[PDB]
C-alpha cells in the first residue's frame, strides 16, 4: 500500500466490525467489542460517493442517432463515417479503461491514507500513556474505562489526567 | 492502579469476492464496487420521447 497501513502494519481487516469502514476494537474491565469511527467512515463514504457521481454525471450527452446510410457509389463517405465511429470508439475505450485503472488505485490508497491518519491521531493523543504493540493496537499504562475509551475515539483524550499514573506504571513495568 | 486495557485501529472486511483492476495490480478483491459499464438491454424496441416507432 502507498501509505503502509492497509495490508501493512495493520495486517488484515475485521469481519467482526460490520457497521463501518474504519474503526476500533477495545478491551477493558467492562468487556470488549468492535466499534466504527463514524466521522472518518462518513467522510470517506461522502468522498467516494462524490467520486463515483463525478465520474458518472460529468458525462452529459444529447439526443443523437449514430447510424448513417450510403448507397453503393458513396463508399468513401461511408468509410469516413466508419472512421469517425471507430475513432470515437478507440478514444472512449482507452480512456475508460485507464480511468478505472488509475482511479481504482487512487481509491485503495485513499482508504490506506484514512487508516494511517486514524492510527496516527490516536498515537499522537496517547503519547507515552500507552505502548505501541503493533498491528494498530495500543496497550494502556493506565486503566481506560468505557468513558475514557470514548474520549480517545472522540479526540478528547485527557493526557494530563492519567499521565502520572501511567508514568508510575510505565517505570515499574520497564524496571 | 494496575495498568492494562487495549485499543486497536482496524478496517472493514467481508465475504465479498468482487474483483477490480488497478494500474499496479490485477484482480484485487475489494469489499465494495460499482459497475460503470451497462451491458444489459431489455431485448425490445420501445418509444423514444414517449412516441412509438413506425414499424
Amino acid at each position, epitope marked *: 500500500g502507498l501509505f503502509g497501513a492497509i495490508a501493512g502494519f495493520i495486517e488484515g481487516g475485521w469481519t467482526g466490525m460490520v457497521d463501518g469502514w474504519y474503526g476500533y476494537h477495545h478491551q477493558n*474491565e467492562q468487556g*470488549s*467489542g*468492535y466499534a466504527a469511527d463514524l466521522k472518518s467512515t462518513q467522510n470517506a463514504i461522502d468522498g467516494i460517493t462524490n467520486k463515483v457521481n463525478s465520474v458518472i454525471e460529468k458525462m452529459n450527452t444529447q439526443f443523437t442517432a449514430v447510424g448513417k446510410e450510403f448507397n453503393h457509389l458513396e463508399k468513401r463517405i461511408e468509410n469516413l463515417n466508419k472512421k469517425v465511429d471507430d475513432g470515437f470508439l478507440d478514444i472512449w475505450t482507452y480512456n475508460a479503461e485507464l480511468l478505472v485503472l488509475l482511479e481504482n488505485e487512487r481509491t485503495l490508497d485513499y482508504h490506506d491514507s484514512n487508516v494511517k491518519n486514524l492510527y496516527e491521531k490516536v498515537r499522537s493523543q496517547l503519547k507515552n500513556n500507552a*505502548k505501541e504493540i503493533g498491528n494498530g493496537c495500543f*496497550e*494502556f499504562y493506565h486503566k481506560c474505562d468505557n468513558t475514557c475509551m470514548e474520549s480517545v475515539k472522540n479526540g478528547t483524550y485527557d493526557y494530563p489526567k492519567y499521565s502520572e499514573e501511567a508514568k508510575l506504571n510505565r517505570e515499574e513495568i520497564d524496571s | 492502579a494496575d495498568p*492494562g486495557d487495549t485499543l486497536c485501529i482496524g478496517y472493514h472486511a467481508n465475504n465479498s469476492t468482487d474483483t477490480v483492476d488497478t494500474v499496479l495490480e490485477k484482480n484485487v478483491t475489494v469489499t465494495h464496487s460499482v459497475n460503470l459499464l451497462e451491458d444489459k438491454h431489455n431485448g425490445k424496441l420501445c418509444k423514444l420521447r414517449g412516441v412509438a416507432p413506425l414499424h
Partner: antibody
Amino acid sequence: EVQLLESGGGLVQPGGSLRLSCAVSGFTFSKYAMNWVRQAPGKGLEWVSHISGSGISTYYADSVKGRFTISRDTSKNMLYLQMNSLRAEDTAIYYCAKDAISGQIWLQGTFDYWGQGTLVTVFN
Amino acid sequence: EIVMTQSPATLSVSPGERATLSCRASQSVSSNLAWYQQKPGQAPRLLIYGASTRATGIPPRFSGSGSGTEFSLTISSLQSEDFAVYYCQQYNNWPPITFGQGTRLEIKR
C-alpha cells in the same frame, strides 16, 4: 511438545495466601497470552484471570478482584497466580491455559493447551 | 457478563450413532465460540474454535456450526473415546470469559 506444569497448591485456612506457578515449555512464551481457569470439585469450568503476552494487561473474574493477582516472568518461562484473602468457595482445581493465537487481540480468549492442574482446598 | 446455557445437560445415545449438542447465549457472540472436551481425570481439551473450525489434531468426525445466539456441536460417528463432557465458551465480549454448564454424553445400553 508444549508442557504446562502447575504447582503450589495445597490446604489453607480462609484468609490465607497461596501462590501458584505454571512451568512453560514448548513455545515462545513472549508471543502468547496466559490465563488461569478453575474447576470446583465435580463442577463446571470458570475463567479466573488473564495476562497478555506483554504483561501490561490483566483481567480478573469479579469474585477474585482485589484478592488474586496474575503475573509472568517471560525470561524464566513462568506464570504465577498470587491468591490472598482466600475463601472456601475458592476451593477448586486450577489450570493454566495458553492462548491459541498470538498478536490478534480481537481473536483471543481461546485456550489450546491446558496443564493437568493443581488443587487448592480452603476449608476452615 | 454473557450467560451461556447448554441444554441438554445429559444426552444418551449408542456408540457409532450421531449426537447433537446445543449452546445458547444471552447475547450475540458472532462466531467467537469455542468447544471443549474433558474426559474424566484429564484436563479440558480444545476441539472447536470460531464455532466451525476444528483445532489441530481434531478428527473430522467432530462438526461445529451456528452463529449469533444459537450454536451446535455434532459428532458424526460416536466412538467410546468421545463419551465425555463438552463445554462451550464465548470470547466475543470478555472479561469475563464465560463457559456453559456443560453436557454429559452417556453410553446407551
